[PDB]
Amino acid sequence: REILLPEVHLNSPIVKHKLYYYILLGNLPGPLHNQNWNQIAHEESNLAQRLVNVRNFLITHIPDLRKGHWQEYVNVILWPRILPLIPDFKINDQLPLLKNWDKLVKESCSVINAGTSQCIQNLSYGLTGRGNLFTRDIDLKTVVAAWHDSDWKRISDFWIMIKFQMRQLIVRQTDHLITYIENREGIIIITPELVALFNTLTYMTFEIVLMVSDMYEGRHNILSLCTVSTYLNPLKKRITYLLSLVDNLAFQIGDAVYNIIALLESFVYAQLQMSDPIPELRGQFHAFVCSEILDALRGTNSFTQDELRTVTTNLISPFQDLTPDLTAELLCIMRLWGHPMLTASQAAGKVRESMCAGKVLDFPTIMKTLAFFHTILINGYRRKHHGVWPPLNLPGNASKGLTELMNDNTEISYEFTLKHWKEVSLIKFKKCFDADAGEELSIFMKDKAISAPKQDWMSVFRRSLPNPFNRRLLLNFLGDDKFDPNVELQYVTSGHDDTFCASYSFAKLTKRMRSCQVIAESLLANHAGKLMKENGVVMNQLSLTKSLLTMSQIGIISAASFLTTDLKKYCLQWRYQTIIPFAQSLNRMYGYPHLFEWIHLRLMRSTLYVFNPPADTSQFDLDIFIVSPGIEGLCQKAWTMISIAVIILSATESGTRVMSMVQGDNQAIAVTTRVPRSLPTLEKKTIAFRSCNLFFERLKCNNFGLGHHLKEQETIISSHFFVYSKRIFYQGRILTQALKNASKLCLTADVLGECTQSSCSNLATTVMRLTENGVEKDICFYLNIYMTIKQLSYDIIFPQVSIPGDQITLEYINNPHLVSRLALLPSQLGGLNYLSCSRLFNRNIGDPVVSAVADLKRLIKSGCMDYWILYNLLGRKPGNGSWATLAADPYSINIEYQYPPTTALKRHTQQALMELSTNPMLRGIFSDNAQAEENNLARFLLDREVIFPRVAHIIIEQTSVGRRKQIQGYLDSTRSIMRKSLEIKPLSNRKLNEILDYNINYLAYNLALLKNAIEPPTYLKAMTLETCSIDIARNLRKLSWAPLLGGRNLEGLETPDPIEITAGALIVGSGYCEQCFTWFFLPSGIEIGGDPRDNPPIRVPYIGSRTDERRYIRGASSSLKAVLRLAGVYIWAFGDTLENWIDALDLSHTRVNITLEQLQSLTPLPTSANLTHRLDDGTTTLKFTPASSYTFSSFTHISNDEQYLTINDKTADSNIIYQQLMITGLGILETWNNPPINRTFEESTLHLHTGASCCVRPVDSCILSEALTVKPHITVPYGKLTLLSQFTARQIINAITISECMYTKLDELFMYCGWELLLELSYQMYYLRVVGWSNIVDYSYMILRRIPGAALNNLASTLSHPKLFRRAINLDIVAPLASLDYIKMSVDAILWGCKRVINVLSNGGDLELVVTDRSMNLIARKLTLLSLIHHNGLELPKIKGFSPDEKCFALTEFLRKVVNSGLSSIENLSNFMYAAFASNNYYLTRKLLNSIRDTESGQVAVTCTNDYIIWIIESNANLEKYPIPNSPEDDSNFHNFKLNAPSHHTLRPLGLSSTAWYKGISCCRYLERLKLPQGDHLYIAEGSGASMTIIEYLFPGRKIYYNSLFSSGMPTQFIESVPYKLWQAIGMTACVEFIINRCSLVHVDLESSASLNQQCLSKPIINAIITATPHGVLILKYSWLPFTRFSTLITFLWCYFERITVLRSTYSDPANHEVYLITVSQATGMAMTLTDQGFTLISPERINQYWDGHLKQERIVAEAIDKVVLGENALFNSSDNELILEPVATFIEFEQLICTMLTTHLKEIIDITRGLLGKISTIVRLLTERILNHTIRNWLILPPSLRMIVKQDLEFGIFRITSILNSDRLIAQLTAGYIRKLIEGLTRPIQKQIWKALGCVVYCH
Amino acid sequence: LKITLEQLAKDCISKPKMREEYLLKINQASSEAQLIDLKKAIIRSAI
Ligand SMILES: [Zn+2]
Ligand SMILES: [Zn+2]
Structure with missing residues (x-):
């Protein structure tokens, strides 16, 4: 009662000892002990008394008390299952509680039914419209009616009731009877340790009833969920058949059933691998497992042939005619029969069968794998060290290894090291290498199992004829004195004693050996564990999932054969004399002798034991007993390294392109070939099969040599059948491993800190894994609703601390609307619902509060009987709160009940522990007044002008008190250890009551959220009409946190919500949506299970993108890194004041007490970190497996080809929302193709518009000065500047093994790019035959033409459509002369670069090699001079030698040789031999760049009707030509193909918005080139006050026709010009029908994204019929960015009208132009095009004219833009335009005027410093905008160099200040001392506007 | 292993005789x- 209720789900095994002990303590009608009973009876139990009462009850109560032979009266504890299933207590009158439960839940559902359906339907419309389809109806009410008012539930309910009764009885027992339920048809007896059942009688101990209750509730959950239409009748029928049959059999036999169930586990894979393509694997594993089942069945005497045959047939029957995923689910539920009961004897006997069995080892094999361990270690250490290898690595024969050593080759090929023995002998007895010990204070703060001393039995159990220990490693260590992590190790490795007896359960042993064990494992996994090869497990999650899916893919192309080895006994098979090679090697590698093996040694002279049959046995005894054999789970890291070694060896012993993954003992291998690419799949799979068979035979042979009885029980092979950690991978996708997690849908969470809240939490997360794979999302939403409802009911009726007094439970159980309005609001903002909507499509978070109000607005505006609760949330009484509470977590709304008790319990436990300390000065690590200082520092950091909780948390984390709290937080929280802590009773009495009544007070609070409170007037309007969540979230957070800080209102956070912002629309076939920018593609692809060659694309796997934007006398990392990050954040990268830096230094000086005091006036290297979002913490623990699902986010083809951000380094300010948007699109698409599907659905796209944003909220940046001068207190033990070009080339080509900072450049960039590439490759030359010029160019190009990814990034993010490509094609760096291409250019550049260097290499050893320890620069010089001799040599051979000076001597000799044969000036030969140094690339590069920020002319060194037509074809022009559709976008290169180049807009010279009429005059020119008959002039859907007018001005017709898409509300400019001259004298058929009911030309224009068929065919139909109502020619705007569609569109047009001629523009910037184009029936011609999709084109060569004309136009428009940014004109056509159709003057002192504006704005700024809106962002942005307009107006006053500067800046580099330093001309200086930074301070539409304005001005004068 | 071939052949062919x-x-x-050889032949006889 007082604390710590017992558990609810067992984490302890079930034995056969203790249950028998109970049931034979009394007379309840073989065993492993036959000793005595009355001894136990009077042996002080009182359970004898209780069970005497039980037997009295039973005997006197039943009639069959004394009869013949029990034939009426049978007790079957032999696992009755059909009996628990049978009506043991099925009498229909349930306890009135459960009926109330049903009433409440059902009523809540009937209430909230209609609303949630509308919520989901409106969610569907909002995203695309009517999702969640099947190829029938669902509803919440249908969910509950088919989930809970269907059969197979009453049993679960019954056992839940029994479980609760037993729990409460155990509680009462702890407080210090039984319950007797007499009734018709049964009798119930419940004891605190045993329960009885009868109606045919049985007994159940505590753990047993728990197991069976869990089993039943899980089974009910599974079958019930399968009743939902998602994964329907197949699995339902199969699971029910299998359940009935296997339960029957379990009764029929006994424990043996479990074995076949064990075999049934692995059985699925067999049934699953019957892949008809590749044979012999089916008949391998299927047959093996079926025969093994036959054996493990017959072994226990069932029947001979008929029963065996038929029962095996029936156990196989539930697997036929299924798909793989269903089988996987059926597996994960096939484990559903309760963990069997144990018996000590059998387990001890098996592990004895693993005792001595033979010293059969193959010395050659163990030596070979030793050599490979050596080479792996050496290669790895050389890799990361990036210097030399170990101090001594060459003891032995062969000067070739000695060459490898003295030369320091970073590589030792496996092929090589196979050819030798003892590749090194790192074995001595002197010293230590490359490591040290005594660190990582974490481990000892964690406790593991620990056994008793020598005298064990009397301590381990009762029933003797004696002393107990009951100790704990954690208590002992925390209460240990003079502990030294070092001296313990030498005490261990020294003289052993007989005080060590390890026990078996898990395994445990004495304190000192377990301590040294964990120490050694920490050392290994800390230093040596890092060196990993052949396995992708470096990073936590992304690397794992990515590597896995890439393996399963690289199996296939548009060569797959895996096999996997899995079991645990593998670990307990090794022996000493096959480990001491590696043990000794590693031991000597880390110094101290004979350490890494000692376990075996002890196990030599020791015995073990897993309750004991006593005759006489108390000491060393031979044999339920183990005598000195491996081990269950200790030290297994060495096992991992050795498995790595052996897999490498067996691989390289044959031609094996091997790839590996391994966790614990379960591992999976893929092997690959070089199969010829024309043979059918069968042949390729056959070659792969032969290869993996060779590898597998060799692997088995080598393992047996090493000794491993590896069998077919553990090794399964196939072509496409990966497995890893219970997650299977099949033909490039993760299988839907859902239903097992479905079986985790419990009723109450872990008991430690149990509370309603936490319970629902698990629910959500559990349902969340269910959301991830398989089942449709809506079902998951509904299921979460149902589960929270049911669980809230279960907790509100019969609580575990039930109180009859209060009325809160009364008002809850009385109305159902209340529980609904508590289970339908985001739990972060109060309530029991954890992320219904948003998390449904993303694992990320953003801000919970904005997502919470997104949920709330969605529900309300959809209708869930909620409107007034919002205002109540607003005017909610703000909770107590504190500086520190806000501190330790941001995103935090101050509410009373948001910390579950388990947190407070953890805190109290850890603090009580830290109260125990007799250690070294770690005592100071705990002080009582800590939390006061914590809140004090939170105040100091947070009671200022502008305060940010994110930086608050980061600083408080990295500071002095931070790591202190961290240490005191990294303790265990196990029930045992927290119970032991609570055995220190004095926590308090108050908090005791608090935790004792938690859920009650929580429900009382939320009940106080009854019908609305009073709505204050301000907020009433302030929040009404749900405009946008973010402002609501801002106001809510402000109002809530108010009572502490008040006036200040924190911001600087709250990125938006995905579903709130994004609107999007799906498209299939011909779809028209919201008028216009990301998009996802999905071609007509057949799902998994078809044909590898017919998968339309090359299957490319995308991953939830999680990037890490990571770009000196001592440099080794320590707490010094912590202070680095501290200062970097605390300075904000803008706030640089003496106060601020003094304070940062001070917080440092208090933090680092690691070395001596740190007094540096300015920590030099701390770099800027607030310019970015590089602020977070994580990545510490071992694993996190449950990745995700992918079955159609595989053929996905994303592309960011539309503008979202420009040339910039947003650095996770937008990548976060970008990451969310990508994952959200993927989830939308998958959900749209979730269930079993085909290619039946056709090519489909998804276009997400980001335009609909009710608020966007542009970012801001400013400063403040904090001052409250309080501090924590502690002292414990812890000229020309092409250098930018040089560094840029260095970093870039360094990355290949993002155009900012490459914008101010020269061709020297690619010069040095080529230089670095040539340098590296030249060292790789090693004088292989390459003559100077041509062969070096060829080999360079060949080594370049590979590894695309990095080249992709470079191309996209630098060679983009802005001036960079313009400059490039102007300098002839590239060459564009069918190539509709963008990528090849990239590599050409590099090649060109290299080639250019050759020319300088022709004469001159200049270019001053640069490097970013002196041996490094020496070998760099060596590499360079090697390159030089390789080029300009070509007269004599040369030899390799040493690195330091040998090649230098060879160079001097070869120079003296070439003294008589050269090209250069001959003296410079000596000067040929005649090196710059840096610190780190990124810092120096960005610092030097920001040092170029002085007004400079480095840009100087960088310094109408001429379009035409491509007259495609004529009448009957049939001559289909070859498609050559080679196209861009191989992989998703970054967002630059046509995004931004607005400077073109000056060539449409008027000041209006339409500006399209320029195109009008062009097309009218081309029209006048042609004759055209009487006019009707139809302009379909366009003309919006735009072009059309000019046409009549040049071509009048009769009876004009106008259309546009009708919106909420007419052509403007048309009326604005002509009608005076006039008066002088989304839908398919309705709109086109209005047109047909209402000759000459028509005008049409739109655009959408990729869909390989047309969707506006109605308009060609329009033209056909309108000219029918002649040769009236069309005008049709289009573009071949997706040239396929363009060719398809021209072929479709070619239907009727011949002589089609397209004409290009002259105003669109360098970009794929927006060119203007001029059978039997419509659908049949469309079909002609459809079947002409593949090979049908009429543009085989005209592409030549198009593209040379495009480059012409590009040059012309660039020249023209520079002409009009100057004084010249493009007239004789602007006047034709004007016919039809800030004002400030200019002075030289406009710069003085700008100074005036600056001074006035700064005065406003300093003045203001001294729903709502912004503060300094608004005024500063308006200042800059005003300055911009003023400059564009005063343009004509000009120091022209400055005009060129700002020309570039507006051309991407927007608005660097001109008059920087002259802001000098005192108070306006000191009041804001950051004037420089402020002066050092971009939206597309604004850019188009300013370009048009500049053009208007330059035309005006 | 008997029922292995049985289930496989049932999964392969359709003709009653x-x-x-x-x-x-x-x-x-x-x-x-x-x-x-039965396995090989029957799994080959599916066209
Ligand atoms: Zn759109
Ligand atoms: Zn908005």
């Missing part, structure tokens, strides 16, 4: 090479 004859050959043969 051929199904019957094949199952007959399966349920009586006792030379393992003949079982492997």
